[PDB]
DNA sequence: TGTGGCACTGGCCGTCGTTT
DNA sequence: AAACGACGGCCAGTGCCAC
């Protein structure tokens, strides 16, 4: 007695599926070792299909691709408020597979109401190659049976028989349910009257019986409720698991069901022959490119035309003519393209010169053609060159792409690959047939237009954005669970910050308990959190929904729906149901179109510069050795500079003091864990104060120097390693690539294969092999943190460009930096403090003068309206457009009647006041209070207006401003931050000078004050905290120092600043004092005994401090022996001396 | 470590519901 | 049948995945 589950749900039934693809497939395998089969039938989607096929196929299980369709009562177009029913479908052959793909697609594209639904119409259309089963209790026939409409059920049975023929089976399942008894009994009658054959299933949703509760809380995560609600989403029993053929019999006894329902299970599974196209199979689906031109000839054409544009001094009309005579401008390229490969290799046998360039270009074209990739290049070149001629910015390149001269020639790429040390072989390895990946950056504003170009150009049915998913992140998992358990957001957020982040994304909970000693306790305290943490790791291995790729795009060769199912996201984007890898594992052409912020920023910069001073910023024509740019990076003014804005990175650039672009390239490449540590070495060697020696490899030195000299002996770049291994070992440059992959995989002992191969070629070349083995040790060491130079170089250029703008412009530059990141309150705050500490005035927004983004009026910088926090984006434009058709706003009333509450709601209005956007109308506190009365007023004006009434009869013109007391500084500054993310103008701290007097400088004053003191001093600073390496901020600047909106006093050591002690608020305002005199630099000899005797005459026990405003820096001399007795303050302010009773610095 | 993207949720308001 | 209350989405806010 065996059995094969044909109705099984996986993790891909996103709402109620709990069976993970892996442990489900082993449980089927361990239960039935003989010819095991499993059908993936998920709720109205085909997501898992490919990964399920390839996981089951590598486990020796036979996969069956299925679909539990939502079928609409009538038409899939119905948006009726009957409903929809279930139907089990299985694909028996590949045409079957394809039809599932179409149905699953159509369900989403044509039939999506609440769920994606299909028609009995469209089922009939795509019925070829499909087996159908009568379905679960929620299906049509059993549903009709339950409703006592046996006539409708038989009529529907007939309808389906008319569609599927003998590929229709009566589906019989049994859990304890009383409805199942009635349905199956009548189903049994139908099955015998029409001679239909019953198939047993049991609609699994979890793997084993123990998973019932895990699944039951899964539902409580979608239902977003507590374990005890009630009314929380629950299944009727705990039976929906992958049962043993024995447990199946317990539900379906032999003396009542016989063997048929079981035997039919195995028979169907046998007759379900569906093969995809993965691994062994897989066809390359390269879309066709329209062109008496070969696909390979035209790519050639464009390359020759390209070089002439690319290298004007060394590749000319004259030059090409010579090459043809060695056998119009365009006519020569058209001709050179035809030259065959047997003809070409009869010239070579007869610094980057003209001839050198030809060879590299001709070589690359040779490899491209042979692999059969010229079509691929044409497609890419086409849409990039479109985007340029259509006001869409394009990055110089990303990833290995910029290594190809061809790419650069034909304008795919925009950095000279041979000026910098970029290698074609790192992009396409000539010695491995593998499809290259070409990712491209576009202006983030316009990227969609480029995708749209492709959509139109290659076909609507052939272009979609590869799909993206999503796993449940450890942090997000904790928060979602904590919500459910009725835990306050804040203490939950503290639990989420305990989990380490090792590479962008958080670590698992399983670990995060080993790695965090406090995520092994927070559990001991509360029993509530005991569950939360265990539950969150039980739910970790989960996904969100299915987005289109921020970058992923597929151009298929044949209609997408023939192989890959589709979706349409909320913005109408056509999206793949398969992810990145699944799509790529079906051999489909996948590109990345990235929206890059920096590009969008460099556009507004150019625009603003032009309008400001008539200068045409031609980024692709700028000198790359401009002094004032590097001097700015050397000063560490990286505030808005692409790629190098990290706290640490900023410090490193100040340390390095880069002088040429190559410094940026190397800095960006090495600054990462990892490699971060190699930078001090780089610097001391860069500053000509440490020899670069290769004594540890005397015989390899002849190869090492030429490679590692450029970078002071340090292997920084992946390319550097590849070359080392290619030259020392005799490896093919393409093989060295494979080696670097194998260094990265760290394959247990397959690494020892390359070792022996390395030493072999190493001896054969030079090294005595004692070096070889240890040289390989050096490679495996640096290959962990190694780098692709083409990618580094290309990106570095954007950094430069960014910095160059900031160096030379400067106001519009800053306003563009603000504009580009206007929706980030943290960055906006940052950019403002950069601008303000750079010499200009920066004003809060204003409904009468502000534009949408940062704007320059006269000689001031003025915040945009989009900068205000609760104001929508529609509202910001609305306000501005209303101000353009009617005049400037005359008063608050005039504002409120012109812009109905429909558009600028009360919440929005409030922020707008708090920002200072309406300050042109009077006192803020007064404006906030005046709101609701004037909103009532404004709403009432339209009532009279839309009831006839001219202009005097329709307006009892706006009452005065409802009175209230002016806001204090703390509360006013508090509102600003809430409304703008940052403080603008002041000053909070300047309201109580109690703290000012105790503190020991101004964040600004640190460098100036400390320099002249002892060696590596200690100091006390007070400001605000801004980090989850916390950042402290005055009204004068910020600092790195080793939660938010909490003030602190800090005792720390200075060299960078290292914290040693800290403290708190109401506590600080409780501690005190002791007499501080403030003396100028202008003090006589006969004063330092004027002041000395004044204090001598009033003893006590208060220490005396002196603020000596020096020439460069403000010193803090605490007196000596003298201890004043308080009374001295009044008698001291009774002369040209300013004094205060400040809290005593000692105590802290 | 931006940028590009996204869907999911949570904060805040009108409709629908149920209770009276 | 009228006034008082929950669910609705709303729209907005707020993190995680391949480049
Ligand atoms: N972890 C990461 N963080 C940031 N950017 C990344 C990361 N991984 C990749 N990228 C970016 C670099 C590229 O500009 C783009 C394409 O990545 P990827 O295809 O992995 O590398 P590549 O194209 O430079 O090399 P390859 O030849 O190995 O594909 O994504
Ligand atoms: Ca790539």
């Amino acid at each position: 007695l065996k059995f094969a589950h044909l109705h099984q749900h996986t993790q891909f039934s996103l709402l109620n599926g709990a069976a993970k693809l892996q442990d489900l497939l082993k449980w089927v395998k361990e239960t039935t070792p003989e010819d095991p089969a499993l059908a993936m039938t998920d709720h109205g989607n085909l997501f898992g299909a490919v990964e399920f096929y390839k996981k089951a196929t590598a486990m020796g299980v036979k996969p069956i691709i299925g679909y539990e369709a939502y079928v609409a009562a009538e038409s899939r177009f119905d948006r009726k408020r009957g409903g929809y029913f279930h139907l089990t479908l299985l694909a028996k052959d590949f045409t079957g597979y394809q039809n599932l793909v179409r149905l699953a697609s159509r369900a989403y594209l044509e039939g999506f109401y609440e769920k994606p639904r299909i028609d009995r119409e469209i089922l009939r259309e795509h019925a070829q190659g499909l087996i159908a089963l009568s379905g679960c209790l929620g299906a049509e026939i059993p549903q009709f049976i339950l409703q006592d409409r046996l006539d409708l059920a038989e009529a529907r049975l007939n309808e389906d028989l008319s569609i599927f023929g003998d590929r229709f089976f009566i589906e019989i399942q049994n859990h304890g349910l009383p409805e199942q008894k009635k349905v199956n009994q009548v189903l049994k009658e139908f099955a015998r009257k029409y001679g239909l054959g019953m198939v047993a299933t049991n609609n699994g949703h979890y793997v084993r019986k123990e998973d019932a509760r895990a699944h039951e809380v899964l539902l409580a995560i979608q239902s977003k409720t507590t374990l005890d609600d009630p009314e929380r989403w629950r299944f009727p029993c705990d039976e929906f698991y992958v049962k043993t053929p024995e447990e199946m019999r317990a539900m379906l006894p032999e003396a009542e069901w016989g063997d048929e329902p079981f035997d039919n299970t195995v028979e169907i599974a046998r007759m379900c022959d569906v093969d995809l196209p993965i691994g062994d199979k897989m066809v390359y689906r390269i879309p066709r490119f329209p062109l008496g031109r070969t696909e390979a000839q035209y790519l050639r054409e464009l390359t020759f035309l390209g070089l002439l544009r690319r290298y004007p001094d060394r590749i000319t009309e004259a030059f090409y003519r010579e090459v043809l005579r060695l056998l119009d401008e365009r006519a020569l390229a058209e001709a050179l393209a035809r030259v065959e490969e047997k003809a070409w290799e009869e010239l070579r046998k007869r610094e980057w010169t003209a001839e050198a360039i030809l060879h590299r270009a001709l070589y690359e074209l040779s490899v491209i053609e042979r692999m059969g990739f010229p079509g691929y290049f044409l497609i890419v070149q086409d849409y990039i060159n479109w985007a340029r001629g259509h006001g869409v910015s394009v990055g110089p390149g990303r990833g290995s792409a910029a290594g190809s001269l061809v790419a650069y020639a034909v304008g795919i790429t925009n950095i000279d690959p041979l000026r910098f040390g970029l290698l074609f072989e790192r992009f396409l390895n000539p010695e491995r047939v593998s499809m290259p990946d070409i990712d491209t950056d576009f202006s983030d504003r316009e990227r969609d237009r480029v995708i749209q170009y492709v959509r139109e150009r290659y076909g609507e049915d052939k272009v979609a954005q590869i799909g993206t998913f999503g796993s449940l992140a450890s942090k997000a998992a904790l928060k979602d669970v904590a919500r459910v358990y009725g835990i306050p957001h804040k203490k939950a957020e503290e639990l989420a910050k305990l989990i380490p982040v090792q590479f962008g994304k958080p670590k698992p909970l399983q670990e995060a308990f080993e790695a965090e000693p406090e995520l092994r306790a927070e559990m001991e305290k509360d029993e509530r959190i005991r569950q939360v943490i265990e539950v969150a790791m039980r739910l970790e291995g989960l996904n969100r929904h299915a987005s289109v790729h921020a970058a992923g795009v597929v151009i298929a060769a044949e209609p997408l729906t023939d192989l890959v199912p589709l979706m349409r996201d909320q913005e109408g984007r056509p999206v793949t149901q398969y992810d990145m890898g699944a799509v790529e594992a079906l051999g489909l052409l996948k590109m990345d179109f990235l929206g890059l912020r920096t590009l969008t920023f460099l556009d507004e910069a150019r625009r603003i510069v032009k309008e400001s001073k008539g200068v045409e910023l031609d980024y692709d024509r700028l000198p790359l050795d401009d002094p004032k740019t590097f001097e700015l990076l050397s000063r560490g003014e990286t505030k808005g500079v692409f790629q190098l804005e990290s706290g640490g990175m900023t410090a490193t650039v100040r340390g390095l003091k880069p002088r040429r672009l190559e410094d940026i390239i190397a800095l960006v490449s090495l600054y990462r864990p990892g490699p971060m540590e190699h930078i001090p070495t780089y610097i001391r060697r860069h500053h000509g104060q440490e020899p670069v020696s290769y004594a540890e490899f005397p015989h390899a030195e002849k190869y090492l120097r030429p490679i590692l000299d450029e970078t002071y002996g340090i292997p920084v770049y992946q390319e550097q390693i590849m070359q080392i291994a290619s030259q020392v070992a005799g490896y093919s440059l393409g093989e060295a690539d494979l080696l670097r992959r194998a260094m990265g995989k760290k394959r247990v002992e397959e690494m020892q294969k390359h070792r022996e191969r390395f030493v072999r070629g190493a001896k054969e070349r030079g090294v005595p092999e004692e070096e070889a083995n240890r040289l390989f040790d050096m490679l495996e060491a640096f290959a962990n943190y190694g780098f692709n130079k083409s990618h580094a170089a290309a990106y570095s250029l954007l950094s430069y460009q960014t910095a160059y703008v900031k160096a030379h412009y400067p106001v519009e530059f800053m306003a563009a930096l603000l504009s580009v990141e206007r929706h980030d309150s943290d960055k906006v705050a940052e950019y403002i403090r950069d601008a303000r500490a750079l010499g200009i005035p920066v004003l809060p927004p204003d409904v009468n003068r502000s534009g949408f983004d940062f704007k320059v009026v006269g000689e001031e910088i003025l915040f945009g309206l989009s900068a205000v926090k609760n104001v929508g984006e529609m509202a910001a434009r609305a306000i501005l457009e209303e101000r353009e058709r009617g005049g400037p706003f005359k008063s608050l009333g005039d504002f409120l009647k012109r812009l109905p509450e429909q558009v600028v709601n009360k919440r929005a209005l409030e922020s707008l006041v708090k920002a200072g956007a309406l300050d042109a109308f009077g006192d803020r506190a007064r404006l906030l209070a005046s709101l609701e009365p004037l909103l009532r007023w404004a709403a009432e004006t339209r009532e009279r207006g839309r009831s006839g009434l001219v202009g005097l009869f329709a307006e009892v013109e706006e009452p005065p401003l409802v009175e209230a007391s002016p806001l204090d500084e703390i509360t006013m500054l508090r509102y600003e931050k809430e409304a703008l993310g940052i403080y603008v103008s002041g000053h909070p701290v300047l309201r109580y000078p109690g703290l000012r007097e105790v503190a020991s400088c101004t964040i600004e004053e640190l460098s100036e004050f400390v320099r002249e003191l002892p060696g590596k001093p200690k100091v006390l600073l007070s400001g605000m905290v801004e980090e989850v390496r916390f950042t402290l901020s005055d009204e004068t600047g910020a600092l790195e120092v080793v939660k938010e909106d909490i003030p602190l006093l800090v005792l720390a050591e200075v060299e960078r600043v290292l914290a040693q002690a800290v403290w708190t608020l109401e506590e600080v305002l409780e501690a005190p004092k002791a007499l501080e005199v403030e003396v100028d630099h202008a003090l006589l000899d006969e004063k330092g005994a004027r002041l000395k005797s004044l204090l001598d005459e009033h003893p006590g026990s208060l220490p005396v401090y002196l603020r000596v405003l020096g020439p460069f820096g403000e010193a803090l001399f605490a007196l000596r022996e003298v201890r004043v007795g308080e009374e001295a303050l009044g008698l001291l302010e009774a002369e040209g001396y300013r004094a205060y009773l400040v809290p005593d610095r000692e105590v802290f």
Side-chain angles (χ1 to χ4, degrees), chain A residues 398-400 426-427 437 439 503 740-741 788 791 795:
Chain A
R398 63 147 24 194
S400 66
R426 212 225 162 269
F427 170 59
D437 236 43
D439 315 313
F503 215 84
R740 191 206 79 258
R741 319 269 185 142
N788 179 210
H791 181 248
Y795 272 51

Side-chain angles (χ1 to χ4, degrees), chain A residues 12 21 25 40 42 45-58 63 65 97 101 276-279 563-565 576-588:
Chain A
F12 291 94
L21 229 56
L25 288 170
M40 188 207 78
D42 283 316
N45 79 60
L46 232 46
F47 298 145
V50 181
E51 191 204 321
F52 177 84
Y53 175 91
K54 76 186 171 202
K55 283 205 173 185
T57 211
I65 294 158
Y97 167 72
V101 171
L276 301 180
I278 279 182
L563 203 83
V564 168
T576 303
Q577 283 194 34
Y578 295 157
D579 75 285
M580 269 280 110
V583 168
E584 282 210 314
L586 291 166
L588 288 176

Side-chain angles (χ1 to χ4, degrees), chain A residues 472-496:
Chain A
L472 222 197
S474 314
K475 285 190 184 179
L478 250 188
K479 288 176 186 182
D480 277 13
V481 169
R483 280 178 177 175
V484 178
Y485 278 93
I487 289 174
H489 167 263
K490 300 167 182 181
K491 297 218 166 190
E493 252 278 59
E494 285 178 311
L495 280 148

